[PDB]
């Protein structure tokens, strides 16, 4: 019916929902990737004192 | 019907909460693997 559809509307949310938590993780964890690119880097400049000694 | 849609929405309500929560937990690890990032920066140093 009528009140069934709407049941399955917002189950669909609930899986949109959920999906935004799965691309917001994601996202995070990309930045913490990228973060540690930069440590990396760092670390690279340190090795390249030494390789400059 | 009307009964499953309020179980429905406050799954979605639920799954609503649960993707803030999610990204705030998320952002915290970043953060925390930063912080990893660091001791494996000390290590690579």
């Known amino acids: ?53 | 019907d009307e009964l499953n849609k309020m179980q429905a929405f406050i799954r979605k309500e639920a799954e609503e909460k649960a993707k803030e929560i999610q990204l705030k937990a998320d952002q915290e690890y970043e953060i925390e693997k930063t912080n990893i990032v660091r001791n494996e920066t000390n290590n690579i140093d």
Do not use: C, M, P, W
């Open chain 1, 1 to 53: 019916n009528g009140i069934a559809t709407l049941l399955q509307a917002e189950k669909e949310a609930h899986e949109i929902v959920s999906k935004a938590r799965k691309y917001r993780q994601d996202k995070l964890k990309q930045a913490k990737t990228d973060a540690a690119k930069e440590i990396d880097s760092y670390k690279i400049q340190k090795d390249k004192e030494l390789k400059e000694f």
